């Protein structure tokens, strides 16, 4: 499914992402916007044979297991296919682990290039949260 902007912001807030590890809600909504355009079914092949999955484009080399990626680590200990549900629970849980890897949200390429250093609050603006 393709989440509405405010709909996703509300869902992420109930999942405890607002100010999680110091990152205000806007950061997470912005990351999802540029990583998957709020599409829970989005997937993109990478170059090391890995594939990125879901609304937060979680990688199959370090975070989830898709059974075909070289050097798999599965640090989130979860099948990548489980990160494609219309329910964001799995993606959020894994995202909380990724952001604690030692690089903060810099782990997300789209966040670095389109959200970091910007007015991310604009992404939750107008939402009745």
């Amino acid at each position: 499914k393709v989440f509405g902007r405010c709909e996703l912001a509300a869902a992420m807030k109930r999942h405890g992402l607002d100010n999680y590890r110091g990152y205000s809600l806007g950061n997470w909504v912005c990351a999802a916007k540029f990583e998957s355009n709020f599409n829970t079914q989005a997937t993109n092949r990478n170059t090391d044979g890995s594939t990125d999955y879901g609304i937060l484009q979680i990688n199959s080399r370090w975070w989830c297991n898709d059974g075909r990626t070289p050097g798999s680590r599965n640090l989130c200990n979860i099948p990548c296919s489980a990160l494609l549900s219309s329910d964001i629970t799995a993606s959020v849980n894994c995202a909380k682990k990724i952001v604690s890897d030692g690089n903060g949200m810099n782990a997300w390429v789209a966040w670095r290039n389109r959200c970091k250093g910007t007015d991310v609050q604009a992404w939750i603006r107008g939402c009745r949260l």
Partner: antibody
Amino acid sequence: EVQLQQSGAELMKPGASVKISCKASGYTFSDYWIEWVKQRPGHGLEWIGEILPGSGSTNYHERFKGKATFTADTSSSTAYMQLNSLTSEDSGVYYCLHGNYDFDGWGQGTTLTVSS
Amino acid sequence: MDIVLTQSPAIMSASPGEKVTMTCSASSSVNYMYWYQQKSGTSPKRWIYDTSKLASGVPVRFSGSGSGTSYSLTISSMETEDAATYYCQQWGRNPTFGGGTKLEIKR
């Protein structure tokens, strides 16, 4: 024993669309990607794209975006590839296949001829 | 981006017992290389994955190696049934296959 059974040969006229099936068996259909490849004499092999049944997710090679569309029916464990706006250049053999640490068999291939 | 894979020799012949080596050169560096074997009239079969791992049923006389922009497939001792066309493939964002090396029997 995993198997991928494709539909038979196709003969289509230019401008039409065709849908090729790939019936899977021997494993959990929704847990594995099914890729597709095109083969033409002299041109070799070309990767088209892939689909992960059940999630509805798909990845396409940039050269096939807009030409191929993958769908799947979990009630029968069958994946499909639809090719639109057919031209003579689309004639060839098409394969569905697996590529992972558990198995990597290819379907028997489907021959497509596009001509008036 | 289109990564071009050039295989050589394009066509070669070998007698049983002979060592065979074929190369696959990439226009850009790739992390891993894959190889597939195809015999006339039948579907390709994955032969080597993740650069040096043998697919199921592949005999130990086959080996894969390489890195960066140069990879290879080697048969320690050619057997009659090894005659076929071998295609290399980079399995990245937009997978591409080499033009193949046609291995024929020398007589």
